[PDB]
Amino acid sequence: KVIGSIEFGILSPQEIRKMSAAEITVPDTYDDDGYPIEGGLMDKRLGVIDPGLRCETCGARAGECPGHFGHIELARPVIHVGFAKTIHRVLESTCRECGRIKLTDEEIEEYMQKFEVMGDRKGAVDKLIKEIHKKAKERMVCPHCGAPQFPIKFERPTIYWELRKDEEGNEYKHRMMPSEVRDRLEKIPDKDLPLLGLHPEKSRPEWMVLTVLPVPPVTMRPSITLRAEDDLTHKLVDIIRINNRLKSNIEAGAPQLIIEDLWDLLQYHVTTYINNETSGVPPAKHKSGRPLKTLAQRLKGFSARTVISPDPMISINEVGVPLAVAMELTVPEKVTEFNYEKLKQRVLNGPEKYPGANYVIDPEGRRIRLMESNRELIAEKLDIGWTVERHLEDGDVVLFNRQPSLHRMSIMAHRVRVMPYRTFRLNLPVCPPYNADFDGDEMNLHVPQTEEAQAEAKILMEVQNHIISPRYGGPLIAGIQDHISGGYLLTREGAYFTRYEVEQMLMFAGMDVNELPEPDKYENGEPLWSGKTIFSLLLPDDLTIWYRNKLCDEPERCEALEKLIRKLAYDGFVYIQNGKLLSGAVDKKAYGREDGKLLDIIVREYGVERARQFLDQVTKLTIWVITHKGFTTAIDDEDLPQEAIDRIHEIIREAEEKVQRLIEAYKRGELEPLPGKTLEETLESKIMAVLAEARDNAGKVAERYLGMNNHAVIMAKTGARGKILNITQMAAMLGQQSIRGKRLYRGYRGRVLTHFKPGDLGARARGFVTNSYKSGLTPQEYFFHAMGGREGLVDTAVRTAQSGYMQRRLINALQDLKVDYDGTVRDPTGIIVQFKYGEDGVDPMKSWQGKTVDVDRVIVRTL
């Protein structure tokens, strides 16, 4: 009862005459300002549009009433403009008198057999189509008409010719009539059409010459009230206007020429009806100059939104929905034996309370509005089979959306948890997939209705089912910033939590009763809890994993592994054993997105219920540690003593004179040019590298004279928004300010700013800040930084154009591709684009960082 296929073709006169409701003969419209009903083009058993129901037997009032087609018996045949070039390509490729494709038996036999090998590719079938055309177009001796010399054709816009013979060496051009052409196409047998671009059953050539013109229904020609008549109707009026004149002149006297003039005129009018923007055809305009837009101009030319707020106290798959939004958005629930009581209490609570309802739909289908009247007599013998539109309940399937919708991860299924106030609450680890922050970002909320839709979203789009990103073999939903810092503090060498802290705060997670909390590792200094052990209270009793932490570098790289070929004296190489955290500290390496080593493992091995649990309980774990201990950045965190200051000062002076020596050398034409680049570019390139070298060195100096064990540094080295590239900019120096590559030059005719000497190519002159954000920028530097800062604005905002467009292109190219059940990626036209997807057939969302089953890992699993 749904659409398998659609098979296009060309309408036969018979069809148009049979599918017609009445023969249109009177060239007129409505008329006028009162009583709009005639007997030709308007509702003469054809279609309804005014508030009056009368129609073609089907009655069917103006409301809901599919339009009926009509027809026009053309007094003479008329070439269809859309087929003109095709009709031409057909005429001079086939034989008149004959009906053959002017090809030898051999040619047909091997051509058709070369035509079946291409029977699906629309692009590659035209090459052979035109090739065939030209091969027949050159011959004049067809194998099915004793050959009678074929007068080549001419064309356009809708006229045909044939340079025949009658004299001798002459080449007069016999004119071509639609009747002649059509009756000449009617000879071409069904056997030859396949060798062309036509069908014996779907698209006969003779039908390309219209003998009957199908009239669009009333519903497709609506009148645009102020009435602004429909264009189609007007042009049609002209067409019938000439058609009737023609037929009336044929029935009477026949001076031939008269009939020819009128025939060609009719031809013009139909040509315009098909396409007003045609070539060689004067656009039929309305009395204003404004061109009529016909057919070729016709087919051409439950949610919510609000601000978002964080909530690490709700489940990762849950969504906070303001109860007001919950009272507007409703769900269709058919009353059955299990919710009979609930729904009755809901509808009785009315549109008020909190668990109420707004509408009710009885089995007949009539919607009942619970506002007016009262929830009393309305909520009676409901019986099973009705339908209540109840307000959003805690747990309902709901789609959360944030635009722009880059990857699929932008729309995820959530579980409504109705809460007051007026914002959407999003659990914090689900921020990376949405790419949302908070400053002012707003998101969309969708409420699906049909049970199939809700289920489908709940089974396939639920948050927990998409912790890992399909782009790369790793988790997308994880720790963000505090989760990282909290994981570090919780898993530190000196992590000793008094009973008060452990006991009271484990309630942010769960899991204790008996052999979980036990037993207090340290009673040395005092009876206390080691953080490693408290963290250990979550991981299952069989995951043994080991991977170097972020600090496993520099001369602190080391190693000292030891395989099994128990004490504890390790730190870097994080070692977790059956839930027990032996060594290591939690950071960007341990948790967080992008990574690919722990959160990854617990989702492959134990994917749905466990993964969400480990995620959910960890945030609240890590958060309370951070909160109860105190975590801040002060202003002294970036301060360096006088010693580092004097050192940096001497460094920037050195770099300055390095640049001057380069300039003084350039002035005297002391050559020394770089190999590839131009001389002027050599100077610039050498300076930029010289200054960049000095910049990194200044930053290297900065990381020494600053305590590496205070809060700020932890964040840099840990895994909560960090980058040595920015640290150098905050304390040491920002560096060279550039504009689309080259240095800052665009200014006055002789310099950048009016504070330097004309031609000064010095360090400070061509835009180089020496001071960082701490020490403060000078008037010049502040301006230079602004000139260089405009880059990020323009660049980042411009990239969107190419990203969006490029993606939109490749999306509109691959959107059809699926994995067939035989494990094969095939285009929608049955073309094996890839025997077994991705060569191996392993979904990138389910592979171990590209590897088709991480073999080294599976083997180790032997305990």
Binding site: G747, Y748, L753, Y782, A786, M787, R790, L793, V794, A797
Partner: protein, 102 residues
């Protein structure tokens, strides 16, 4: 050239970024000055009208709003003269004279 004319930070976000900007605190816009008193004082100080000139290389070429009125004798002489004239309050402050050097 925006230094002291356009705000380096005041820029609306979006496609309007860079196109539309704001006037600096330290910035005035020219009022109106009829070319009469201008021309008159100009010639009167040594500008040699075009109705005569060759000029090139008259070692000079003077312009008024793109209109080459004429030439004088020494360049720095004219620029310093008109400038100091303006500083003495003898001529309107809205008159600017620039000596391009090439």
């Amino acid at each position: 050239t925006h230094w002291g004319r356009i705000c380096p930070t005041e820029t609306p976000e979006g496609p309007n970024c860079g196109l539309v900007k704001n006037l600096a605190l330290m910035s005035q816009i020219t009022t109106g000055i009829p070319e009469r008193e201008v021309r008159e004082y100009l010639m009167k100080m040594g500008v040699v009208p075009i109705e005569e000139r060759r000029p090139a290389p008259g070692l000079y070429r003077v312009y008024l709003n793109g209109v080459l009125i004429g030439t004088v004798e020494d360049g720095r002489k004219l620029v310093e003269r008109i400038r100091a004239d303006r500083r003495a309050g003898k001529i309107s402050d809205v008159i600017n004279v620039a000596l391009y050097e090439d």
